[PDB]
Amino acid sequence: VSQAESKVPLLGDIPLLGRLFRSTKDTHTKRNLMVFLRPTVVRDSAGL
Amino acid sequence: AALSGKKYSDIRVIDGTPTNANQLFDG
């Protein structure tokens, strides 16, 4: 999660008009990854 | 374990300062 701002240093702080001056850029990012394995032993031709 | 707990709390408080509430793990 990342977030940059850029504002006029007096006017962006006011939490009534702070949207009207700043410039924000947010970036959320997820990567989930699993590597599973499954062995099956066959030694007679029936199971094959 | 004591060092790990102190450093983990000291990084949790940096999480404790959008930028919503971050998460514990299986300690």
Swiss-Prot record, chain A:
Give its localization.
Cell outer membrane
Name listed for the protein in its UniProt record: Secretin XcpQ
Record remark on domains? The N0, N1, N2 and N3 domains are periplasmic, while the secretin and S domains form a channel that is partially inserted in the outer membrane. The N1, N2 and N3 domains each form a periplasmic ring; the N0 domain was present but not resolved by electron microscopy. The secretin domain forms a double beta-barrel structure; the outer barrel has a diameter of about 140 Angstroms while the inner barrel forms the central gate with a small pore in the closed state. Isolated N-terminus (domains N0, N1 and N2) assembles as a hexamer of dimers (i.e. dodecamers).
The entry's function note states: Involved in a type II secretion system (T2SS, formerly general secretion pathway, GSP) for the export of proteins. This subunit forms the outer membrane channel. Among its substrates are PrpL, elastase LasB, chitin binding protein D (CbpD), aminopeptidase PaAP, and metalloprotease ImpA.
Q: Report the sequence similarity comment from the record.
A: Belongs to the bacterial secretin family. GSP D subfamily.
The consequence of inactivating this gene is: Loss of export of PrpL, elastase LasB, chitin binding protein D (CbpD), aminopeptidase PaAP, and metalloprotease ImpA, still exports LapA and AprA.
Q: How does it assemble?
A: Forms a cylindrical channel with 15 subunits. The closed pentadecameric channel is 170 Angstroms long and 140 Angstroms in diameter.
Swiss-Prot record, chain B:
Name its cellular compartments: Cell outer membrane
Record note on disruption phenotype: Loss of export of PrpL, elastase LasB, chitin binding protein D (CbpD), aminopeptidase PaAP, and metalloprotease ImpA, still exports LapA and AprA.
The organism's superkingdom is given as: Bacteria
Describe the protein's quaternary organization and the partners it interacts with.
Forms a cylindrical channel with 15 subunits. The closed pentadecameric channel is 170 Angstroms long and 140 Angstroms in diameter.
Q: Which family does it belong to?
A: Belongs to the bacterial secretin family. GSP D subfamily.
What note about domains is in the entry? The N0, N1, N2 and N3 domains are periplasmic, while the secretin and S domains form a channel that is partially inserted in the outer membrane. The N1, N2 and N3 domains each form a periplasmic ring; the N0 domain was present but not resolved by electron microscopy. The secretin domain forms a double beta-barrel structure; the outer barrel has a diameter of about 140 Angstroms while the inner barrel forms the central gate with a small pore in the closed state. Isolated N-terminus (domains N0, N1 and N2) assembles as a hexamer of dimers (i.e. dodecamers).
**Cited function:** Involved in a type II secretion system (T2SS, formerly general secretion pathway, GSP) for the export of proteins. This subunit forms the outer membrane channel. Among its substrates are PrpL, elastase LasB, chitin binding protein D (CbpD), aminopeptidase PaAP, and metalloprotease ImpA.
Name recorded for this polypeptide: Secretin XcpQ
Upper lineage is: Bacteria, Pseudomonadati, Pseudomonadota, Gammaproteobacteria, Pseudomonadales
Q: Which residues of the full protein are shown?
A: 611 to 647 of 658
